[PDB]
Design a protein around this ligand. Structure first.
Ligand SMILES: [Ca+2]
Ligand SMILES: [Ca+2]
Ligand SMILES: [Ca+2]
Ligand SMILES: [Ca+2]
Ligand SMILES: [Ca+2]
Ligand SMILES: [Ca+2]
Ligand SMILES: [Ca+2]
Ligand SMILES: [Ca+2]
Lengths: 383, 383
């Protein structure tokens, strides 16, 4: 009996474990409307345990008359991080999001090659409670990245912030090279698109939304109207019973800097060619098969290259990792990292620093004043 | 300077982190010899820190005259677990291994459809130290699985057990359906093959091995001669400085039992069809896209189905997982799992048990004697 509970417990948990690993945004063409439709589920964590489901139905149509790209079926994958600004007294949300497209094997776009300013404006009415939200920040589609801050401009927000995240610019998603012809969102720009949703909160009310997303000069603007009906006074939404919120923003900034040493052409992905070049410049000799297998281990989407969200996952997932790192730096294996050896590694990686900056790095690590870094000093610096 | 150490530390560690995630056995055809060649590296952990590399070079040739299958390039992926038998006074090793083939996108074999007995015999000479090893157990290629116990028949083994693992039957590897034409090993049977290696222990001696692997009646036999030269008296090998050794064997047996509830045709893999059937019989309604995405999350080899080693990884990688499992069992959501509800889940999963056995499961969990299982009782049973 204790064995039967184990066997059937494992199976039921396997299914849970399989299901909670996914919340993709499934996109399909809508030819008759010269646009797309999407559907997906969001699971909002309830503060003291449990999940509140939010079922999303989406349609998008172009605003302008020029041709747009209508895709084959595919999906977006997202990771969101919510935080608070310690200096802000107004009701507010700070948001960092990474989004990439996947699901397919093997002029608007030029508007998105660099960092683009974003404005967001929402006017809402949930069960009669009128409120407004204003948001500003920037998007960098090279990295599938959004960073934004939102304020409630009418006082206290009558709903939880996490319930507004999906409503509050999919044109900033990263489409990999093999899927460029499937990016409706950027194809619609600069004239833009209309995006409409219905969002059903299980056992509670629904939101209906309509938004215009378009360029106004060089700023990508998302202007939205939202109406919520049939919400329960003491449900998870009007009762504020959902969790609000991981690495820090500055920890993520460090990993971007590291990622740039491999991504030498700045296209947002590390190929086998780029990884091999960095490995060989440090004295190592992987085969092409090994490079492919290395990438394949962290390759979310099977396109054969490592983008920034992939790289992040990997570096957020040891004593022995640090010993091997030491060996890479200690070229002649005598037990000490010399300023010459450090300068060499920096050059090999592509980092440009003066001899003075390299000595400053030695100084930061050099506890015993011999002007070299030993293994224990290196550990202290790595931890 | 503290930021520069972070950035360049991250890059160097990324490479370490990328490299240590792989130790594949790379196979190529050797047409002139009507066989294959392989090369790979093994990293043996040194007891107090560090790794001892062991560079492997391999050739295999058929013993008999009938046609064999010569493959496209591809690799095997392995996981080994070493243990000791608490009842055995002789110098010995207990081994459980899982091996699958990958590296390609999208009559001998019939000898391997079930469980096959294995005998292993080795005679060796390392730096003049003559010794022998005998091993017995079984292989089940459906699951890529080997289970064996080895004894040193000459007394104390003069080398570490982990150094003999690769020498001590790749015919038990699991080749997935799309790679059946690339399985040299099974194609050579029953007459068998000769397998030869050179194994270079970095900074130390080398092993040369020659073995005959073939059927003798219904037993797969591996008979080996090994010669080791140029070893250092105080190196990691003759000095026994390597680590010997994870889930238990009986924990792994439980997961096999669970896996069988999904793998209803016993072929060793879970398709999307099989996962959906089990999910729907428990009242859930995934789309085909969701099923594919679920599998793809644990899919080591991109063949679109879940084999047993994949399933194991996943279940060895929470309070909320158990709450959702409870909900699956508590069909009517009243807070209590009834014997009727339990019987229903068992039937839905395919488990056959009498009503008496189901009441015994209730009894094992039922702390307060009401003949039903509540949430707290279910937690106790799951932990
Ligand atoms: Ca690049
Ligand atoms: Ca990729
Ligand atoms: Ca040195
Ligand atoms: Ca020093
Ligand atoms: Ca099956
Ligand atoms: Ca698979
Ligand atoms: Ca019930
Ligand atoms: Ca009870």
């Amino acid at each position: 009996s204790r064995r039967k509970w184990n066997k059937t417990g494992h199976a039921v948990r396997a299914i849970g474990r399989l299901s909670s690993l996914i919340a993709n945004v499934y996109i399909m063409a809508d030819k008759q409307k010269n646009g797309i439709k999407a559907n997906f589920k969001i699971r909002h964590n309830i503060e003291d345990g449990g999940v509140q489901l939010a079922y999303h139905y989406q349609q998008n149509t172009p605003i302008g008359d020029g041709p747009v790209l209508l895709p084959d079926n595919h999906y977006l994958s997202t990771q969101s991080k919510l935080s608070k600004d310690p200096n802000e007294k107004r009701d507010h949300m700070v948001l960092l999001e990474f989004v990439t497209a996947a699901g397919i094997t093997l002029k608007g776009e030029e508007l998105f090659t660099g960092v683009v300013p974003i404005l967001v404006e929402l006017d809402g009415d949930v069960n009669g409670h009128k409120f407004s939200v204003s948001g500003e920040g920037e998007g960098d589609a090279t990295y599938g990245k959004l960073t934004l801050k939102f304020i409630c401009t009418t006082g206290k927000l009558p709903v939880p912030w996490p319930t507004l995240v999906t409503t509050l610019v999919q044109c900033f998603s990263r489409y990999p090279d093999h899927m460029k012809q499937h990016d409706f969102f950027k194809s619609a720009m600069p004239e833009g698109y209309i995006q409409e949703r219905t969002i059903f909160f299980k056992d509670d009310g629904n939101y209906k939304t309509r938004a215009e997303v378009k360029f106004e000069g060089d700023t990508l603007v998302n202007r939205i109207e939202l109406k919520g009906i049939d919400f329960k006074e003491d449900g998870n939404i009007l009762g504020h019973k959902l969790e609000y919120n991981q690495l820090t923003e500055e920890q993520i900034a460090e990993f971007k800097e590291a990622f740039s040493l491999f991504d030498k052409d700045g296209d947002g992905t590390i190929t086998t060619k780029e990884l091999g070049t960095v490995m060989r410049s440090l004295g190592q000799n992987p085969t092409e098969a090994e490079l492919q297998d290395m990438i394949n281990e962290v390759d979310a989407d099977g396109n054969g290259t490592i983008d920034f969200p992939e790289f992040l996952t990997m570096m957020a997932r040891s004593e022995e990792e640090i010993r091997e790192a030491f060996r890479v730096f200690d070229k002649d294996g005598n037990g000490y990292i010399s300023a010459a050896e450090l300068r060499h590694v920096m050059t090999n990686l592509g980092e440009k620093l003066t001899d003075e900056e390299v000595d400053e790095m030695i100084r930061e690590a050099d506890i015993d004043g011999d002007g070299q870094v030993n293994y224990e000093e290196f550990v202290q610096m790595m931890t």
